[PDB]
Design a protein around this nucleic acid. Sequence first.
RNA 1: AACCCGUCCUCAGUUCGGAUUGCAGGCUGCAACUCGCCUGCAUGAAGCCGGAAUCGCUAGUAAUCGCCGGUCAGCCAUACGG
RNA 2: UGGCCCUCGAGUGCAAAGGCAGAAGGGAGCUUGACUGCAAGACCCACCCGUCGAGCAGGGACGAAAGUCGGCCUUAGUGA
Lengths: 60, 121, 171, 66, 111
Amino acid sequence: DVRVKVILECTGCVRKSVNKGSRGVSRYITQKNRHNTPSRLELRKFCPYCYKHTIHGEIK
Amino acid sequence: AHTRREDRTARHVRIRKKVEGTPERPRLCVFRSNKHLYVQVIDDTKMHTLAAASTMQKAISENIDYSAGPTVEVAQKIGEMIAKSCLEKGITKVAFDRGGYPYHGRVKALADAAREHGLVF
Amino acid sequence: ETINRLKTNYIEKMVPLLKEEFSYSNILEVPKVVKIVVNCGIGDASQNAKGLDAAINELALITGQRPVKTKAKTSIAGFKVREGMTLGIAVTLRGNLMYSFLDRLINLALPRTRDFQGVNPNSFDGHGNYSVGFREQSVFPERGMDVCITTTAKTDKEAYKLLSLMGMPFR
Amino acid sequence: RKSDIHPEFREDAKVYCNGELVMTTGGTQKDYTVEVWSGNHPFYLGNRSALLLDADQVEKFRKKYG
Amino acid sequence: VRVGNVEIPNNKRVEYSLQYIHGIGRSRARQILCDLTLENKLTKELSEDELLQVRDEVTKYMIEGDLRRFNAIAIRRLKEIQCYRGVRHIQGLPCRGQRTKNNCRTLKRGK
RNA sequence: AACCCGUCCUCAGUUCGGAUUGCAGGCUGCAACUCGCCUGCAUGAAGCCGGAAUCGCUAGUAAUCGCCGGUCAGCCAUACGG
RNA sequence: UGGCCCUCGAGUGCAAAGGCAGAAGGGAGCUUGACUGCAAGACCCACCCGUCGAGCAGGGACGAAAGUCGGCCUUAGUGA
Ligand SMILES: [Mg+2]
Ligand SMILES: [Mg+2]
Ligand SMILES: [Mg+2]
Ligand SMILES: [Mg+2]
Ligand SMILES: [Mg+2]
Ligand SMILES: [Mg+2]
Ligand SMILES: [Mg+2]
Ligand SMILES: [Zn+2]
């Protein structure tokens, strides 16, 4: 199980938002190798709830 | 090995397969020699040249005076006269063909001076 | 005593002299030195860094210009190498350095070689170019190398005539 | 030439031969010292034949007896 | 290259430092100093004019170059002419009447 | 001769070690190439006290220094006998 | 390592075919579009599946700009 699917969570979204626009959190999913990339994987991707691109980082 | 003229022509073809002159956005290409500059504005669909501005024109040859080759100040004048020559024709948009040479240098001054007023690119 | 001997001696004395030798219809047909490529190959460069980082400085003082870590064009197991690893040490000499380097060649390093009896005149490749091989570099007043001289000559005769004027003692 | 990635190469670095300035060249070092410069070495002044035969042994036979 | 196209050490005396030269033995090292009538000081501390005066006088003998060439042609003289002594060099064996039954490890090793 | 006095060499294949080879000479002798002994120079190998094993020596002995002689024109004697 | 000659005979992570030479191959710099919400119209075809896709809004990367990008030269790397 060298390769593994990694889950990316938005850094900036909050739980149980009381806003009028949209409530929730952005979350993508991609591939990522462990040995070839022992560090985490943070990327600036789009967030529909935050109306902008934000740094989505590994939840685990 | 390859010479400067051969490598120049290769750099111009790789550019030309992306930029394309049209009636709505003609093609502005530049040719710098060892002693002169030269510019054309072409609608590639019609294969016709709409405007042009050279170093050998009388309206500017009397003004500028260079000994060795055309300087950055010369390019600022070519971009100025060609712009006034374009607006009278009734066209603003244009695609910039850098003639295979790098954008940095006199080519930048020609584009900025031409972009300074009138044209949209 | 002058600043640049070869650059001044060439344009003033040699070009009228070499033109009369072959009777060229134009002055631009004369040959001239384009560059001097100094190679130094070490197969065991991938092992140590001190021997690598040191030898790179040894040639730099001889030439006044940094060498370059030349990499392999392809991997092969016969000599236990890999692609992308450094194998050779090279540098390019052009302009005034090639003349200043040649002054340090014929007069400083080449005479100090042990048991010297002139360089082989048969080292020409057949298109005006010339090469030299060394075992040591301490002959330069400061392991071997392959000095590759380039020239715009078509045949080797004018090259042999060209190089012989700037010293280059041939047997 | 890039700035910080070359030695302090210069021009007209003198070359003494026991205080004798034969000529000057460009180099990194301050000065040089030579004894095989141009003329001290025999191959340059010589015919550059690079071939000797040890002409004859008869000379050893006849001259020694006399 | 200190003198004679060889780098000699600078710490030893003069008499016992010229001997590293291929053409200078133990007697010639003394004859040079005795001709120059100078004192046997260190190698580094020696003056320039005095050290210069050595560089001119040492070149009179078969120091290097022609020395190694004068020998190799002499050994080559015996091989092509095929003397008795010449064949023994080709065989890698001595030529001065040595016995070859239980000795001569030098040349047998230097095959 | 070891040895005493004095200068230098300061742990290095070295001012340790002197094999191998070239050149130039001498003596013996009718004769010195195979196959003698020496001189003058220049080259300067291996070798940093040595496995398993093994030899000598109980007093001027062992260890170490040099001298002589016999056979002999000369001498391969580093031997033999003192 | 230098030069000359023939010119696509190499290479494109892996099988093969097809394609690609100032390139889809080989480097460098900045980057995450390996996006969100869609989608006219087509290819395929028992059914269930599968494939290409102009163009529109949003918020963005690269580029001086024009323009390009909804993973990889294409086709296996998968399970109602
Ligand atoms: Mg010696
Ligand atoms: Mg040893
Ligand atoms: Mg020791
Ligand atoms: Mg023993
Ligand atoms: Mg007893
Ligand atoms: Mg192919
Ligand atoms: Mg590419
Ligand atoms: Zn967010």
